[PDB]
Write a protein that binds this ligand. Structure first.
Ligand SMILES: [Mg+2]
Ligand SMILES: [Zn+2]
Ligand SMILES: [Zn+2]
Ligand SMILES: [Zn+2]
Lengths: 298, 141, 248, 93, 100, 353, 480, 207
DNA sequence: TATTGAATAAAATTGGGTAAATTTGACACTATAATGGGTTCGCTCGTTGTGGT
DNA sequence: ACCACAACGAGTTACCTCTCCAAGTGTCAAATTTACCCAATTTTATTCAATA
RNA sequence: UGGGAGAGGUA
C-alpha cells in the first residue's frame, strides 16, 4: 500500500533548566529549582563558588550516609588533583611528580593495590599526571569500603580540613556563614524526566469520537483528567458552579462548549450548560440493552 | 495505598448525599461525651472531645460551683476553659446520629464547621468532608 | 514462522530494550521476571512472593527491583550468579579444608548450600591460611549464627556476591539505608548520557567491567599497533604473533 | 420514609408502625440506597439496573452523585439556593 | 490517485520552501523549528464536480487532479533542532527521485 | 447426559450421535421411498384435470410464441407433434366428460398420459409451485369454507357429522338442519346467505373439478400423505448424514467463522443436495452431497470475505457504438434503474416483433 | 431540557419499534473499496442518517439550502450527521430469545417469578427438554418438565390435548399465561399458614416481586426479547488505522453475528427444515444474543482475533473503565495543563508561579477577546498570527488578563479537599510551576518530580467560587 | 456565501471515511477560530447569528435570543402600524410577543420542520416528467405540482391570527390583514435582513 | 373626511385515492468415495444464591 | 432446618514512553413507491356601505 | 484521525 518512505532525523541539545530532575547515586533525587549566578553562589576564601547547593535536612531522615562519605572522599580526591595540577602548571620535575603520585597511591591501611611508578617511564608518568590533573579517581568496593580514618588520611595528604568542613562565605552580602559547611564533590546524574517532556497545556483541541470528551495525552494534545476524587474535592468545597463548568462546558457538552468559546471571545464570561453527551451515550446503551430508560419530564 | 483508595471510594459513596438541609431539628437526644480513660491513662480529654459541639442539655451538677451553661450553645474555647476550671466530668451533646431531621441533618446536631471555626452553614456536603477526613490517613496506617 | 515471530515480537517477555545508558541495557539483559506465560500475574500476587527469601544470598539481588506494583516480581541477577543445567541458580564458594581457606571454587545450588556452614566474606584471613578468631559468624539451614573456626565448610568468594550489577556501582553502599539504596540503583538506569563523559572520582572498579561487557564500547579483537585514527574509523595493524599465516 | 409515615399516622390518629434499626455495612448501604443511578455508578451495575428495571423505579435526583452524572448544580454550597428554588417552583406550582 | 513527493506544494509561502530542496526533501543541516515543513507530500483530493473553471484548468495545464490536499510531513510543535540524516526508501518499479 | 453442559457444539454432537448411519443399500431404498412420494404427488396431480387445463393454457399461450420450450419441457421437433397429440387427448377428454364410466376411464387415460409429462427441473419446480398456487388455493378455499361452515354452528357436532356425509352444498341439508326442532335452529335459520355463498363458490368448484367435495378432499389427503412421507423420508435422509457435514466442515474451521455456523451452512447445503438427488446414476450419496457441502461452505466464507425504448436498445445491444453494455452501466447512467431497463427492453422486444 | 426524574422500566416490542428508525437486515457494515455504507446494513445511511455534514450519499444535494430533504437517487435524507448518534434501529428476531440479565443476574427474575429451578429453566432454553403449558387432562400439571421420551409417550398417549413446547418460546408462553393477581393472592394466603422461616422469606421475595410487577405495569413476558434494538453507528464507530485497515469493533462483530444467525434461522424456517437443524439454529441465535448483551456470563466468552473476550454492552456499562465510572463521575477537561512543580520561596500565600508558555496556551480566547476590545486585531487570521508570533503587545495583554484571575492547582491523588486550591498566577519564565512552600503539607507535595495540573475557571461564578471558597488564604485549618 | 460553513462547524466530531487525512495546515481555517470569529462578530451583528443558529437547530437556546431581539425590534418599530399603536402596555407587549414567536417560527420553517415536508417530492420540489422522457429519451425534471416548487408546506399567517384572537377578541380578519399583518411581514423581512447583514459581517471578519 | 365588518373570489393546502412505473428479494451455476471438535490451572478475599443429609 | 460450591466483583489516582492490532450477471413474481386528480377546505387580499 | 491490548516508568 505504500510507495516510498522518507525518514527524517532531528537532533536537539537540551540544557538543564528549572524543573529538571537530578540525582546522585544514593537515592537522593531532586528537582532543579533555580539557576543562580556565580556571584550569588557561596564560596570559600579562594573565591571558588560551589556548583550545587544541596539540602542537609534530607540526610538524617532517609539515612543515606554514603552521600556524606562520597562528598568527603570526593573533596579529598579533588584536593589531590589540585596539587598534581599545581605541580604540572608550575612544571616542577618528573621526580617530584613521581614522589607525590606514589605517596598518594600507597596510602591506605593494608590495601591490596600495589602500584609502583619505578617501572613507569617518564612519558607515562607525565601522561598519568595529565590524566590525574582533574582529580585522582578512587575505587571503593561495596561492603569493602574506605574507612573514615583513610578518608581523613587522604584529606591530610591533600592539605584540606580533616573534619571535612570548610568555612564558606555568602555570595551576595559578602558575610560568612556562622558554622562550617560540608563541601565536596558528589557525582550527580541527569535523569530522563525533563520539563520539556512534562510541560503541557491545552485550551481547546480534538475530542474523542464516542464520548465527545477531549483527548488524553501530550502526544495528541489532550486534556487533564478531572477525575472522581477531584469531583469529591469540589463537592467538599461547595463549588457547585465550578463543578458544573468542569462537567459540562469544558467537556462533552457541545453547544455549551461552542457557546462558551464564543462568549469568552465576546468578553462575556457566562455559560449556558446542558446535557453532557456521555449521558446520552449511556441512555442509548441502556436502551440497547432492551431496557427503557428515559428522562421523565417533571 | 490500593486499599486506602478503595476504602475512601466506598466511604464517599455511602455518604455522598448527606447535606445540612435544616437549621435546628429541635430534639433532645444526644451522646454523653466522657473522657476516654481506658487503660491506665486518659487518651483524649473532655476539652478535645467536646470543643465545637452543641449541648443537648444543660450542665446539672452540684459539683464545685454548680455551673449552668444553657441548652443549644456552641462550646467555644473559653467555654471549654470554663469546663476545665470547674472540672466537669461529662456532658450530653447532640450528634448527627440523633438528628431528627429527615433527609439530612440540622446545623445544631453537627455544631462547629472545623475548617472555619464558627457554626456550620446549611448546604454543606458534610458526608463528603467526613469520608475524605476518615479515608485520607489510610496511607499513614 | 508465524508462531516464532509472534513470540519474538509480542510475547509478554519480549521487551523493548531500555537504552538510556549502558547500565540500563545490561541490567535489562540480566533481569529475572516472575510474570509472563506460565508465571504469576501482577494483580493477584501476595506478600509472600514479594519478600527477600534467605536463599537469595548470592543469586538474586535484594536491593534492585522496581518500586511500584512490580516490586517483588521483577528481580535482578547477582554478579556471580550462574544457572545449572536444570535451571536453578548457583553461586560460587571457596572450599575451606582444615581451616585452610583454599582457592578451589565450587558453584553451590540453592538447596546444596542449606546443609553446610558457610563463612561470611567479612571474616578475616592471614598468610593465605585460616581464620584469625574462634567464634566465627556463619549461616546454615536458613539462619545465621556463630560457629567455631574449624566447623566451617565454605566461604563467600567476594564481598560483592550478594548485590547485582547496578547495586554494586554505589560507593559506600553499606552506609546507606536499603530503601534509598534501592532507589539509587533504580535511578542510575535513567541517567541520560551528557555531552562530555566524566568518570566518577569515587567509584567501585565495577565500572570498567560494565563498560567493556556492555558491548557499547569498541574493544580490540587482536592486539597490535594503531595505524590510522579518525572520527569514524580505527585501523589497527596486528602483531605478527597474533596474525594468522594467510592474512594481512 | 418510615418516620414520615408514622408522623402522618400520629397526625391523623392511627396505630403506627414498630421498626428495628439495621446496621448495614458501607457497601450494602450504598447499594441499598434509594437511587439506582448512585447505586449503579457505585457498584454491581448489572444487578442494580436489573432490579431497578424490574421494579420500575425512578431516581428523583436528590443527591450529589446524580446531579454530577446528569450535570446540574449539586445540592450543596452555591447550588443549594438554586436547588431549593427549583423545589419551591415544582412544589408551589 | 497515487501520492507524490515533490517540492511543488500549493498555497504555501516561499519562505518555507527555502528549507526544502528542488526534489521536495529538506537539506541536511537545516535548523528546523515547530510548524515547519520537512518533506513535501501532496495528496489527490478528488474531482467530484464538473465546472467550466476546472475544465479550463485541466485544459490549460494537464494537472488532472488540480485540487490537491497538501498533507506534507510537518515537525510537531515545541520541537526544534537541525537535520542530521535523511533516509529514503522506495518500492520496486517506481523511479525514485534525484534526491534518492 | 441431559443437563450438565453449556457448550452448544457439544450438545449438537450429542444430538447428532443418536441417529444411526445408513449403509449402501439404506440410502438406495430411502431414495426409493422419496421417489415413491414424488410419484405419489405426481399421480394425485395427474388425475387432477385443473393441472391439465392449466398446462393446456400454458400450451396455447406458448403457441403464441412468448417463451421457449427449452425451459418448459424436458421431453417425454417431437415436442410440437406430441403436444398436438396431447391437445387432441385434452379435447377428447373435454367433449367426452359430459357422459359416467367413460369419463372415469378417460380421467385414468389423462393421468397415465401424464406419466410421460416430465419437464425440465427448474420449470418442474415452478410447475409444482403453480400447482400449489391454484390447487392449494382451492384447497384453502375449501379450508376456509369448512372452518367458516363449522364456526357459525356452535352446536354439538354429531348431527352435523351425519349431515356432513352428504353433499354439504345445497339447501336440503340446510332444511334438514332447520326442521329438526332444536333451539339453535330458530336462531341459526338466517344462515341462508352463508350456504348460498358456499353454493356459488361450490358451483365455481363444480366448473373447476367437475364433481363433489369428497373426491377432491381425499385427493388433498393423498397429496398431504405424499408430501408428509416425502418430508419424513427427507428428514430420515438428512438425519443420517450430519457426520458428513462435520467431516467436511473441519477443513475450514479458522477461515473467518465459528465452528457451528459452518455446520449450519453445510446443513442447508445438504438439504439442497438431497432435494436434487437422484439414485439411478449409480453413485451412492456422498460424492453428490460433498459437492453441495463444499460449495455452500466456501460460498459462505466468500460472503464473509418511442425514443427512450429505442435508445436503450441502441446503448444495450452493442449497436451504433464501439463496445457492448450490460444491464447495469447504461441503467445507472440512464436513470437510477436496474431491472426496469430489463422490463423496458423486454417490452421493446415483445413490441417490435 | 427541564426534567425532575429519571425513570427506568422494561421495554415493550412496540416500544423498541417506536425508538426504531428502520430494520437492519444485512450484516455488512460498509463497502471496503469505496467507504460507503450498505443498504439496510449495520451502518446504513437511509436508516441512521447521512455521513457528511449536510450532504446526501450520492452527492447530488450538497448545500445547506436543502436542509431536510429526502434525496431520490439514494433515499438518505440530507441533514446533520449528528443524527447518527441518536437514531437506533431494530432487528426483528425470527424466534424469541431470553434476556441474559433477567435469567442469570442472581436472583434469576424468572425462577423467582414462576418458582422454577434455574437448572430447569436453562434446560428448557437449551432445547434439552420440554415443559407443559396447559393440561386439559388431570394427569399433567403446569410447569412440569418432560424429557423427550416422556414427551413422545405422552404425545402418542393424549394425542392433542396438552401442549408442551421447548425453548424461549415456551417460557414466553408461560409468562404470558400466568396470572399475577391470583398468584399474589394465593401466595399471600399461603403466608398465613407458613410457619417455616425459609418458606416465609422465599414467599416474601416472590410476593414483593409480583407486587413490584403489578405496581410498575410491566408485562412479565417482556423479559423474553422478540425485537432487538441496535445501537447507533456513531456510538460503535469504525476506526480506520494508519495502514488502510479498519480496527475491530467488538459490538459490530457481535451485532453481525446476531444478524447472520437470524437470517439463517429465517431461511431454515422458510425452507421447512428438520427439527434438529431448526433447534440447533435457535440455540445458536439465543447464545449469540446472550453474548451481545453480556458476553462472559452464561457459557464461555466469545473471543476475538487476538484471543481476548469481546466487549459487549454490559461491559460498556459496568466496570472501572465503564461509562459511569470513567466518563460521568469524572472526565477529561479543557483549559488545563500540567508540569513539574518547584519552590517559589518569594511568593505570598495566594500566589503560584505559572510559566509563560503554559498560561499563553490556556488563556487564548481571553487574549482574542482583549485583542478585539483593544482594536489591535480586526480579523481572526490577524489575531491568530499576533498570538502565534508572541508580540510584546500580546504579552502585555496576557499580563492584563492573568491579573486577578485565579487558577486551580491539583495534585493526584486528591485524598482530601485541600489537594485543590486556587492561587493567583504570576507569569514567570520557565517551564515549571512554582508552588508556595507552606501549602506543600496540604498537597503532600515534595519536589522530587511531583507534577501538578492547572485548571482555569471561566465564568464569573467560577472565579468568585475560587476566590471565596478555594483560595489558599481561606484554607488555613483542616476540616478533619 | 460565508455563513453555512459555520453551521457545518457547530456539529460534534464526525468520523472520517477516506484515505490519508490531516492536511495539517491553515489552508481554509481551523474549527476553533471560526467560533472565535463568531465571537468577534457578535458585538455587532448578533441578531442574524442568533436567528441563523435558531433556524438551523444548532445551539437550540438562541431561539429565545432571536425572539427577544425580534421583540425589541417590534417594540421599536410598532409606532407605524395603526392596529398596534393604540393598545396599552402589557397587552401590546403580549401581542408583540405572540406575533414575534409566530413570525420567527415562520422564518424558521423549512423542509426540515416536523410535519412540513411535501407529500410527493419528499422535499426536493423536483419530479420527473415521464412523457418528456418518453419523447426525448434522456431523463428530464419538472416542478412538483403539489408543493409548487418550494418543497414544503408554507406557514399560514392565520395561525398567529388565531393565537392573538384568544387575547384580542374584537379583532376580526379584515382589520388583521389591514393593520396588523404588515407588522408580521415586517418581522420576517427583518429576520432575513439581519441574517444577511450577519453573513456580510462574518465574511468581513474571516477575510 | 376615513375605517371597518360581512361577504367574497381566487389561490394554497390537505386527505384520500389510484393507475402505472419500479424496486425487492431470491435464485442460480450439479455426481468415484469421502460420515463425531481443540479449548485449561499461584489467579487472593468477601458476598450471595443454589443446591444438598 | 442446617451446611459446601460457582460465580461476581473488588482491589488508589494521575501522567509518560514504546510495539502491535471472486465476480457480475440474467431473470421473475410480488410488493412498493410515485406522479397525478380531485373534492373539500382553509387562507388572504379585495369590495360596499356604514359609521367615524 | 482515534479505539483496544501488552510492556516499562514517575509521584
Ligand atoms: Mg513527591
Ligand atoms: Zn430535633
Ligand atoms: Zn442523493
Ligand atoms: Zn413537492
Amino acid at each position: 500500500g505504500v510507495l516510498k518512505i522518507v525518514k527524517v532525523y532531528l537532533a536537539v541539545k537540551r540544557r538543564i533548566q528549572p524543573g529538571d530532575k537530578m540525582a546522585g547515586r544514593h537515592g537522593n533525587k531532586g528537582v532543579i529549582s533555580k539557576i543562580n549566578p556565580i556571584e550569588d553562589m557561596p564560596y570559600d576564601e579562594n573565591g571558588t563558588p560551589v556548583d550545587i547547593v544541596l539540602n542537609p535536612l534530607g540526610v538524617p531522615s532517609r539515612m543515606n550516609i554514603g552521600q556524606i562519605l562520597e562528598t568527603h572522599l570526593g573533596m579529598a580526591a579533588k584536593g589531590i588533583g589540585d596539587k598534581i595540577n599545581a605541580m604540572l602548571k608550575q612544571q616542577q620535575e618528573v621526580a617530584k611528580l613521581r614522589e607525590f603520585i606514589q605517596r598518594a597511591y600507597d596510602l591506605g591501611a593494608d590495601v591490596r593495590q600495589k602500584v609502583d611508578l619505578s617501572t613507569f617511564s617518564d612519558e607515562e608518568v607525565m601522561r598519568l599526571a595529565e590524566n590525574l590533573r582533574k582529580g585522582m579517581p578512587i575505587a571503593t568496593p561495596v561492603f569493602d569500603g574506605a574507612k573514615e580514618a583513610e578518608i581523613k588520611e587522604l584529606l591530610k595528604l591533600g592539605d584540606l580540613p580533616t573534619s571535612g568542613q570548610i568555612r564558606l562565605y555568602d555570595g551576595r552580602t559578602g558575610e560568612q556563614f556562622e558554622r562550617p559547611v560540608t563541601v565536596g564533590y558528589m557525582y550527580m546524574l541527569k535523569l530522563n524526566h525533563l520539563v520539556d517532556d512534562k510541560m503541557h497545556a491545552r485550551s481547546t483541541g480534538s475530542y474523542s469520537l464516542v464520548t465527545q470528551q477531549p483527548l488524553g495525552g501530550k502526544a495528541q494534545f489532550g486534556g487533564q483528567r478531572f477525575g472522581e476524587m477531584e469531583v469529591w474535592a469540589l463537592e467538599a468545597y461547595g463549588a457547585a458552579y465550578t463543578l458544573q463548568e468542569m462537567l459540562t462546558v469544558k467537556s462533552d457538552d457541545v453547544n455549551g462548549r461552542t457557546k462558551m468559546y464564543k462568549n469568552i471571545v465576546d468578553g462575556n464570561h457566562q455559560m449556558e450548560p446542558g446535557m453532557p453527551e456521555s449521558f446520552n451515550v449511556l441512555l442509548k446503551e441502556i436502551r440497547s440493552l432492551g431496557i427503557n430508560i428515559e428522562l421523565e419530564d417533571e | 495505598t490500593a486499599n486506602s483508595g478503595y476504602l475512601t471510594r466506598r466511604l464517599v459513596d455511602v455518604a455522598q448525599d448527606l447535606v445540612v438541609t435544616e437549621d435546628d431539628c429541635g430534639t433532645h437526644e444526644g451522646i454523653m461525651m466522657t473522657p476516654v480513660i481506658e487503660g491506665g491513662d486518659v487518651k483524649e480529654p473532655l476539652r478535645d472531645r467536646v470543643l465545637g459541639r452543641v449541648t443537648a442539655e444543660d450542665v446539672l451538677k452540684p459539683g464545685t460551683a454548680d455551673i449552668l451553661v444553657p441548652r443549644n450553645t456552641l462550646l467555644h474555647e473559653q467555654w471549654c476553659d470554663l469546663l476545665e476550671e470547674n472540672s466537669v466530668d461529662a456532658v450530653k451533646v447532640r450528634s448527627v446520629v440523633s438528628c431528627d431531621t429527615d433527609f439530612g441533618v440540622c446545623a445544631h446536631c453537627y455544631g462547629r464547621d472545623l475548617a472555619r471555626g464558627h457554626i456550620i452553614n446549611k448546604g454543606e456536603a458534610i458526608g463528603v468532608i467526613a469520608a475524605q477526613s476518615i479515608g485520607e490517613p489510610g496511607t499513614q496506617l | 514462522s508465524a508462531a516464532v515471530k509472534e513470540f519474538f515480537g509480542s510475547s509478554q517477555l519480549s521487551q523493548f530494550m531500555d537504552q538510556n545508558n549502558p547500565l540500563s541495557e545490561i541490567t535489562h539483559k540480566r533481569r529475572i521476571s516472575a510474570l509472563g506465560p506460565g508465571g504469576l500475574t501482577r494483580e493477584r500476587a501476595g506478600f509472600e512472593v514479594r519478600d527477600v527469601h534467605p536463599t537469595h544470598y548470592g543469586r538474586v539481588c535484594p536491593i534492585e527491583t522496581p518500586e511500584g506494583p512490580n516490586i517483588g516480581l521483577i528481580n535482578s541477577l547477582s554478579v556471580y550468579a550462574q544457572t545449572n543445567e536444570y535451571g536453578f541458580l548457583e553461586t560460587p564458594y571457596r572450599k575451606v579444608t582444615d581451616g585452610v581457606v583454599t582457592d578451589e571454587i565450587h558453584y553451590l545450588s540453592a538447596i546444596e548450600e542449606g546443609n553446610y556452614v558457610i563463612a561470611q566474606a567479612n571474616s578475616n584471613l592471614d598468610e593465605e591460611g585460616h581464620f584469625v578468631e574462634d567464634l566465627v559468624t556463619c549461616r546454615s539451614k536458613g539462619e545465621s549464627s556463630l560457629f567455631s573456626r574449624d566447623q566451617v565448610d565454605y566461604m563467600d568468594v567476594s564481598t560483592q556476591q550478594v548485590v547485582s550489577v547496578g547495586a554494586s556501582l554505589i560507593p559506600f553502599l553499606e552506609h546507606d539505608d536499603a530503601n534509598r539504596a534501592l532507589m539509587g540503583a533504580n535511578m542510575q538506569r535513567q541517567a541520560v548520557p551528557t555531552l562530555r563523559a566524566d568518570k566518577p572520582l569515587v567509584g567501585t572498579g565495577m565500572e570498567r567491567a560494565v563498560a567493556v561487557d556492555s558491548g557499547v564500547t569498541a574493544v580490540a579483537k587482536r592486539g597490535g599497533v594503531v595505524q590510522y585514527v579518525d572520527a569514524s574509523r580505527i585501523v589497527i595493524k596486528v602483531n605478527e604473533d597474533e596474525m594468522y599465516p594467510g592474512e594481512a | 420514609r418510615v418516620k414520615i409515615a408514622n408522623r402522618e399516622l400520629e397526625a391523623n390518629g392511627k396505630v403506627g408502625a414498630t421498626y428495628s434499626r439495621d446496621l448495614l455495612g458501607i457497601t450494602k448501604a450504598s447499594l441499598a440506597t434509594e437511587s439506582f443511578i448512585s447505586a449503579a455508578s457505585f457498584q454491581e451495575t448489572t444487578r442494580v439496573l436489573t432490579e431497578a428495571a424490574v421494579a420500575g423505579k425512578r431516581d428523583e435526583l436528590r443527591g450529589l452523585k446524580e446531579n454530577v452524572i446528569v450535570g446540574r448544580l449539586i445540592p450543596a454550597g452555591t447550588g443549594y439556593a438554586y436547588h431549593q428554588d427549583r423545589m419551591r417552583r415544582r412544589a408551589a406550582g | 490517485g497515487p501520492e507524490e513527493i515533490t517540492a511543488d506544494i500549493p498555497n504555501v509561502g516561499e519562505a518555507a520552501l527555502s528549507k526544502l530542496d528542488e526534489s521536495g526533501i529538506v537539506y541536511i543541516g537545516a535548523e528546523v523549528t515547530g510548524g515547519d515543513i520537512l518533506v513535501g507530500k501532496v495528496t489527490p483530493k478528488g474531482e467530484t464536480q464538473l465546472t467550466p473553471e476546472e475544465k479550463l484548468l485541466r485544459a490549460i495545464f494537464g494537472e488532472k487532479a488540480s485540487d490537491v490536499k497538501d498533507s506534507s510531513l510537518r515537525v510537531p510543535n515545541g520541537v526544534s533542532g537541525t537535520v542530521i540524516d535523511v533516509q529514503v526508501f522506495t518500492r520496486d518499479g517506481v523511479e525514485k527521485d534525484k534526491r534518492a | 447426559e441431559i443437563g450438565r453442559t453449556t457448550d452448544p457444539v457439544r450438545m449438537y454432537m450429542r444430538e447428532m450421535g443418536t441417529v444411526e448411519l445408513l449403509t449402501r443399500e439404506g440410502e438406495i431404498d430411502i431414495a426409493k421411498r422419496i421417489e415413491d412420494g414424488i410419484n405419489q404427488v405426481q399421480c394425485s396431480v395427474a388425475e387432477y384435470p385443473e393441472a391439465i387445463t392449466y398446462l393446456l393454457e400454458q400450451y396455447d399461450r406458448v403457441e403464441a410464441e412468448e417463451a421457449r420450450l427449452s425451459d418448459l419441457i424436458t421431453g417425454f421437433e417431437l415436442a410440437r407433434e406430441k403436444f398436438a397429440e396431447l391437445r387432441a387427448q385434452y379435447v377428447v377428454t373435454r367433449d367426452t366428460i359430459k357422459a359416467h364410466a367413460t369419463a372415469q376411464e378417460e380421467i385414468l387415460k389423462l393421468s397415465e398420459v401424464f406419466k410421460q409429462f416430465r419437464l425440465v427441473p427448474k420449470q418442474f419446480d415452478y410447475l409444482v409451485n403453480s400447482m400449489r398456487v391454484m390447487m392449494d388455493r382451492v384447497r384453502t378455499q375449501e379450508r376456509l369454507i369448512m372452518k367458516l361452515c363449522v364456526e357459525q354452528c356452535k352446536m354439538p357436532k354429531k348431527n352435523f357429522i351425519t349431515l356432513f356425509t352428504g353433499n354439504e352444498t345445497s339447501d336440503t341439508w340446510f332444511n334438514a338442519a332447520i326442521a329438526m326442532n332444536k333451539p339453535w335452529s330458530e336462531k341459526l335459520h338466517d344462515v341462508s346467505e352463508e350456504v348460498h355463498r358456499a353454493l356459488q363458490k361450490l358451483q365455481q368448484i363444480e366448473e373447476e373439478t367437475g364433481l363433489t367435495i369428497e373426491q377432491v378432499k381425499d385427493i388433498n389427503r393423498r397429496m398431504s400423505i405424499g408430501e408428509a412421507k416425502a418430508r419424513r423420508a427427507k428428514k430420515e435422509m438428512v438425519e443420517a448424514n450430519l457426520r458428513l457435514v462435520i467431516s467436511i466442515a473441519k477443513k475450514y474451521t479458522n477461515r473467518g467463522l465459528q465452528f457451528l455456523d459452518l455446520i449450519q451452512e453445510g446443513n442447508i447445503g445438504l438439504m439442497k443436495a438431497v432435494d436434487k438427488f437422484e439414485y439411478r446414476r449409480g453413485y451412492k450419496f456422498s460424492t453428490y452431497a460433498t459437492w453441495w457441502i463444499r460449495q455452500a461452505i466456501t460460498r459462505s466464507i466468500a460472503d464473509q470475505a418511442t425514443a427512450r425504448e429505442a435508445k436503450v436498445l441502441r446503448m444495450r445491444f452493442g449497436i451504433d457504438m464501439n463496445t457492448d453494455y450490460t444491464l447495469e452501466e447504461v441503467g445507472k447512467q440512464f436513470d437510477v434503474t436496474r431491472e426496469r431497463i430489463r422490463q423496458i427492453e423486454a417490452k421493446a422486444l415483445r413490441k417490435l416483433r | 431540557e427541564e426534567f425532575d426524574a429519571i425513570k427506568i422500566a422494561l421495554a415493550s416490542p412496540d416500544m423498541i419499534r417506536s425508538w426504531s428508525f428502520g430494520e437492519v437486515k444485512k450484516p455488512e457494515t460498509i463497502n471496503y473499496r469505496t467507504f460507503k455504507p450498505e443498504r439496510d446494513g449495520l451502518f446504513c445511511a437511509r436508516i441512521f442518517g447521512p455521513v457528511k455534514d449536510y450532504e446526501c450519499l450520492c452527492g447530488k444535494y450538497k448545500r445547506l439550502k436543502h436542509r431536510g430533504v429526502i434525496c431520490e437517487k439514494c433515499g438518505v435524507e440530507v441533514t446533520q450527521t449528528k443524527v447518527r448518534r441518536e437514531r437506533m434501529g431494530h432487528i426483528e428476531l425470527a424466534s424469541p430469545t431470553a434476556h441474559i440479565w433477567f435469567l442469570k443476574s442472581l436472583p434469576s427474575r424468572i425462577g423467582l417469578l414462576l418458582d422454577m429451578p434455574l437448572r430447569d429453566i436453562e434446560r428448557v432454553l437449551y432445547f434439552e427438554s420440554y415443559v407443559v403449558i396447559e393440561g386439559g387432562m388431570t394427569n399433567l400439571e403446569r410447569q412440569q418438565i418432560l424429557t423427550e421420551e416422556q414427551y413422545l409417550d405422552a404425545l402418542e398417549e393424549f394425542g392433542d390435548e396438552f401442549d408442551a413446547k421447548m425453548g424461549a418460546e415456551a417460557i414466553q408462553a408461560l409468562l404470558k399465561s400466568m396470572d399475577l393477581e391470583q398468584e399474589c393472592e394465593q401466595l399471600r394466603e399461603e403466608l398465613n399458614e407458613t410457619n417455616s422461616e425459609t418458606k416465609r422469606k422465599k414467599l416474601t421475595k416472590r410476593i414483593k416481586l409480583l407486587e413490584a410487577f403489578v405496581q410498575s405495569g410491566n408485562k412479565p413476558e417482556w423479559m423474553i426479547l422478540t425485537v432487538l434494538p441496535v445501537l447507533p453507528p456513531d456510538l460503535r464507530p469504525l476506526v480506520p488505522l494508519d495502514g488502510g485497515r479498519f480496527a475491530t469493533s467488538d459490538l459490530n462483530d457481535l451485532y453481525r453475528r446476531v444478524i447472520n444467525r437470524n437470517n439463517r434461522l429465517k431461511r431454515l424456517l422458510d425452507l421447512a427444515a428438520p427439527d434438529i437443524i431448526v433447534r440447533n439454529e435457535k440455540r445458536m441465535l439465543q447464545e449469540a444474543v446472550d453474548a451481545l448483551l453480556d458476553n462472559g456470563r452464561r457459557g464461555r466468552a466469545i473471543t476475538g482475533s487476538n484471543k481476548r473476550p469481546l466487549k459487549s454492552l454490559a461491559d460498556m456499562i459496568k466496570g472501572k473503565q465503564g461509562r459511569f465510572r470513567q466518563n460521568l463521575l469524572g472526565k477529561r477537561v479543557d483549559y488545563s495543563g500540567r508540569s513539574v512543580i518547584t519552590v517559589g520561596p518569594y511568593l505570598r500565600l495566594h500566589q503560584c508561579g505559572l510559566p509563560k508558555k503554559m498560561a499563553l496556551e490556556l488563556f487564548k480566547p481571553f487574549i482574542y477577546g482583549k485583542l478585539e476590545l483593544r482594536g489591535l486585531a480586526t480579523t481572526i487570521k490577524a489575531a491568530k498570527k499576533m498570538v502565534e508570533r508572541e508580540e510584546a503587545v500580546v504579552w502585555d495583554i496576557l499580563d492584563e488578563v492573568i491579573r486577578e484571575h485565579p487558577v486551580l492547582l491539583n495534585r493526584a491523588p486528591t485524598l482530601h479537599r485541600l489537594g485543590i486550591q486556587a492561587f493567583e498566577p504570576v507569569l514567570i519564565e520557565g517551564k515549571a510551576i512554582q508552588l508556595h512552600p507552606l501549602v506543600c503539607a496540604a498537597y503532600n507535595a515534595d519536589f522530587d518530580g511531583d507534577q501538578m495540573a492547572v485548571h482555569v475557571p471561566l465564568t464569573l461564578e467560577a472565579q468568585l467560587e475560587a476566590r471565596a471558597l478555594m483560595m489558599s488564604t481561606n484554607n488555613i485549618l483542616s476540616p478533619a | 456565501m460565508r455563513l453555512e460553513s459555520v453551521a457545518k462547524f457547530h456539529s460534534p466530531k464526525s468520523p472520517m471515511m477516506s484515505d490519508s487525512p490531516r492536511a495539517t495546515a491553515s489552508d481554509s481555517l481551523s474549527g476553533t477560530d471560526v467560533m472565535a470569529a463568531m465571537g468577534m462578530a457578535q458585538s455587532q451583528a448578533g441578531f442574524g447569528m442568533a436567528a441563523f443558529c435558531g433556524k438551523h437547530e444548532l445551539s437550540q437556546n438562541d431561539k429565545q435570543k432571536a425572539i427577544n431581539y425580534l421583540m425589541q425590534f417590534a417594540h421599536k418599530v410598532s409606532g407605524k402600524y395603526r392596529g398596534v399603536a393604540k393598545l396599552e402596555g402589557n397587552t401590546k407587549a403580549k401581542v408583540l410577543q405572540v406575533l414575534a414567536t409566530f413570525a420567527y417560527a415562520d422564518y424558521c420553517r423549512s423542509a426540515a420542520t416536523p410535519g412540513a415536508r411535501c407529500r410527493d417530492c419528499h422535499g426536493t420540489g423536483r419530479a420527473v416528467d415521464i412523457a418528456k422522457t418518453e419523447l426525448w429519451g434522456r431523463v428530464v425534471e419538472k416542478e412538483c405540482g403539489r408543493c409548487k416548487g418550494v418543497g414544503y408546506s408554507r406557514m399560514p399567517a392565520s395561525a398567529a391570527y388565531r393565537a392573538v384572537t384568544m387575547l384580542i377578541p374584537n379583532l376580526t380578519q379584515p382589520t388583521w390583514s389591514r393593520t396588523v399583518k404588515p407588522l408580521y411581514d415586517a418581522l420576517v423581512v427583518q429576520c432575513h435582513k439581519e441574517e444577511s447583514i450577519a453573513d456580510n459581517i462574518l465574511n468581513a471578519v474571516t477575510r
